[PDB]
Design an enzyme around this catalytic site. Sequence first.
Site, PDB file in Angstrom:
ATOM      1  N   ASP A 113      46.101 -20.533 -38.244  1.00  0.00           N
ATOM      2  CA  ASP A 113      45.031 -21.281 -37.586  1.00  0.00           C
ATOM      3  C   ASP A 113      44.469 -22.331 -38.544  1.00  0.00           C
ATOM      4  O   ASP A 113      43.974 -21.991 -39.611  1.00  0.00           O
ATOM      5  CB  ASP A 113      43.923 -20.325 -37.122  1.00  0.00           C
ATOM      6  CG  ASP A 113      44.443 -19.210 -36.224  1.00  0.00           C
ATOM      7  OD1 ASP A 113      45.435 -19.435 -35.501  1.00  0.00           O
ATOM      8  OD2 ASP A 113      43.837 -18.115 -36.220  1.00  0.00           O
ATOM      9  N   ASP A 155      44.875  -6.655 -37.435  1.00  0.00           N
ATOM     10  CA  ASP A 155      44.488  -7.605 -38.474  1.00  0.00           C
ATOM     11  C   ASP A 155      45.438  -7.487 -39.663  1.00  0.00           C
ATOM     12  O   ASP A 155      45.525  -6.419 -40.269  1.00  0.00           O
ATOM     13  CB  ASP A 155      43.054  -7.299 -38.920  1.00  0.00           C
ATOM     14  CG  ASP A 155      42.573  -8.214 -40.023  1.00  0.00           C
ATOM     15  OD1 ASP A 155      42.095  -9.319 -39.700  1.00  0.00           O
ATOM     16  OD2 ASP A 155      42.660  -7.817 -41.213  1.00  0.00           O
ATOM     17  N   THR A 200      60.105 -27.266 -35.541  1.00  0.00           N
ATOM     18  CA  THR A 200      59.148 -27.153 -34.444  1.00  0.00           C
ATOM     19  C   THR A 200      58.933 -28.502 -33.757  1.00  0.00           C
ATOM     20  O   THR A 200      59.385 -29.542 -34.240  1.00  0.00           O
ATOM     21  CB  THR A 200      57.766 -26.696 -34.946  1.00  0.00           C
ATOM     22  OG1 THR A 200      57.139 -27.770 -35.667  1.00  0.00           O
ATOM     23  CG2 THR A 200      57.885 -25.466 -35.843  1.00  0.00           C
ATOM     24  N   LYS A 201      58.186 -28.472 -32.658  1.00  0.00           N
ATOM     25  CA  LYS A 201      57.851 -29.677 -31.896  1.00  0.00           C
ATOM     26  C   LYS A 201      56.824 -30.566 -32.611  1.00  0.00           C
ATOM     27  O   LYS A 201      56.612 -31.714 -32.220  1.00  0.00           O
ATOM     28  CB  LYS A 201      57.346 -29.277 -30.506  1.00  0.00           C
ATOM     29  CG  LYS A 201      55.964 -28.625 -30.488  1.00  0.00           C
ATOM     30  CD  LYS A 201      54.918 -29.578 -29.935  1.00  0.00           C
ATOM     31  CE  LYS A 201      55.065 -29.708 -28.427  1.00  0.00           C
ATOM     32  NZ  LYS A 201      54.329 -30.878 -27.885  1.00  0.00           N
ATOM     33  N   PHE A 202      56.196 -30.023 -33.655  1.00  0.00           N
ATOM     34  CA  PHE A 202      55.191 -30.739 -34.442  1.00  0.00           C
ATOM     35  C   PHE A 202      55.869 -31.633 -35.472  1.00  0.00           C
ATOM     36  O   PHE A 202      55.204 -32.380 -36.206  1.00  0.00           O
ATOM     37  CB  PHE A 202      54.263 -29.737 -35.141  1.00  0.00           C
ATOM     38  CG  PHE A 202      53.719 -28.678 -34.222  1.00  0.00           C
ATOM     39  CD1 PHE A 202      54.094 -27.344 -34.379  1.00  0.00           C
ATOM     40  CD2 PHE A 202      52.846 -29.015 -33.186  1.00  0.00           C
ATOM     41  CE1 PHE A 202      53.602 -26.358 -33.525  1.00  0.00           C
ATOM     42  CE2 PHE A 202      52.348 -28.035 -32.324  1.00  0.00           C
ATOM     43  CZ  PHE A 202      52.729 -26.705 -32.494  1.00  0.00           C
ATOM     44  N   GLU A 203      57.199 -31.557 -35.489  1.00  0.00           N
ATOM     45  CA  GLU A 203      58.026 -32.167 -36.510  1.00  0.00           C
ATOM     46  C   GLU A 203      58.876 -33.311 -36.007  1.00  0.00           C
ATOM     47  O   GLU A 203      59.567 -33.200 -34.992  1.00  0.00           O
ATOM     48  CB  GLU A 203      58.951 -31.120 -37.121  1.00  0.00           C
ATOM     49  CG  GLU A 203      58.365 -30.457 -38.308  1.00  0.00           C
ATOM     50  CD  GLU A 203      59.141 -29.238 -38.741  1.00  0.00           C
ATOM     51  OE1 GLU A 203      59.203 -28.249 -37.975  1.00  0.00           O
ATOM     52  OE2 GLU A 203      59.659 -29.269 -39.865  1.00  0.00           O
ATOM     53  N   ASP A 210      51.078 -27.910 -40.033  1.00  0.00           N
ATOM     54  CA  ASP A 210      51.179 -29.283 -39.558  1.00  0.00           C
ATOM     55  C   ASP A 210      49.882 -30.063 -39.764  1.00  0.00           C
ATOM     56  O   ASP A 210      49.726 -31.150 -39.211  1.00  0.00           O
ATOM     57  CB  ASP A 210      51.596 -29.325 -38.082  1.00  0.00           C
ATOM     58  CG  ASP A 210      50.683 -28.513 -37.180  1.00  0.00           C
ATOM     59  OD1 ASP A 210      49.779 -27.816 -37.685  1.00  0.00           O
ATOM     60  OD2 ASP A 210      50.891 -28.573 -35.952  1.00  0.00           O
ATOM     61  N   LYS A 230      37.772 -28.229 -38.190  1.00  0.00           N
ATOM     62  CA  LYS A 230      36.391 -28.584 -38.546  1.00  0.00           C
ATOM     63  C   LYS A 230      36.015 -28.062 -39.913  1.00  0.00           C
ATOM     64  O   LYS A 230      36.303 -26.908 -40.241  1.00  0.00           O
ATOM     65  CB  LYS A 230      35.406 -28.028 -37.522  1.00  0.00           C
ATOM     66  CG  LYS A 230      35.513 -28.653 -36.148  1.00  0.00           C
ATOM     67  CD  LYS A 230      34.546 -28.006 -35.176  1.00  0.00           C
ATOM     68  CE  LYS A 230      34.719 -28.560 -33.771  1.00  0.00           C
ATOM     69  NZ  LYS A 230      34.368 -30.008 -33.689  1.00  0.00           N
ATOM     70  N   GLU A 251      56.363 -11.335 -41.606  1.00  0.00           N
ATOM     71  CA  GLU A 251      55.764 -12.556 -41.059  1.00  0.00           C
ATOM     72  C   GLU A 251      54.379 -12.264 -40.511  1.00  0.00           C
ATOM     73  O   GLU A 251      54.218 -11.395 -39.652  1.00  0.00           O
ATOM     74  CB  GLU A 251      56.617 -13.208 -39.968  1.00  0.00           C
ATOM     75  CG  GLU A 251      55.954 -14.509 -39.524  1.00  0.00           C
ATOM     76  CD  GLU A 251      56.668 -15.278 -38.445  1.00  0.00           C
ATOM     77  OE1 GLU A 251      57.731 -14.831 -37.971  1.00  0.00           O
ATOM     78  OE2 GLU A 251      56.135 -16.344 -38.068  1.00  0.00           O
TER      79      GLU A 251
END
Length: 207
Positions: free
Chosen positions: A109, A86, A182-185, A145, A113, A34
């Site tokens: 990430d 990295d 997730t909470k974005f769901e 998301d 923009k 992961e």
Amino acid sequence: HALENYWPVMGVEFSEDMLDFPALFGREAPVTLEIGFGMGASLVAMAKDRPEQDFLGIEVHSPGVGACLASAHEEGLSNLRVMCHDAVEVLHKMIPDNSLRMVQLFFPDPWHKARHNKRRIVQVPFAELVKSKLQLGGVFHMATDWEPYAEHMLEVMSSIDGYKNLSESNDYVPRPASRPVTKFEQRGHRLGHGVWDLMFERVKLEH
Ligand SMILES: C[S@@+](CC[C@H](N)C(=O)[O-])C[C@H]1O[C@@H](n2cnc3c(N)ncnc32)[C@H](O)[C@@H]1O
């Protein structure tokens, strides 16, 4: 003091040399990577559910590494190792070709923009690098998301010979058990779940 306490047991230092997975994990078993595991909730859940498999996480945000280690220790996991470096350098230097059962990249990430679009990790060269580390039949599973990123991921992945889209609609896949909700769901929401999962299998080159 999770880092101090558990880094010596579960942490893996960056090296100029390739990892030996049998030496690292003490056995021959499938390995899942992961990338950018954050606080490691998914990774710990996955390792807990699959004691027969081995798991490597990479995360440059050291508080996330510490959170992951604390949770892994609390769950008594022996099949999890983590790195704080990295991920691209780790892939290049330390992950053997054709070695991985799965690579997960959850909520990388999103760089909303347009001026930041190149900072998004999912690009052709990165996706090709990941592919080279998958065993044939291995899968690259990413989730986001942010629809513009999802579309970009789809464009990148669809352009690479040797990746087969596991989506039956040639785009996105149902969330597998291997990624927690997730909470974005809003699962089943009329306008969509709010998270896009993409899964591509490594297949032999067609060209
Ligand atoms: C939005 S967070 C998502 C974290 C976690 N997967 C989750 O869903 O909660 C993205 C993570 O990717 C990590 N990250 C970004 N670039 C990375 C890289 N090159 N190598 C390792 N981790 C990276 C960041 O530090 C951050 O923790």
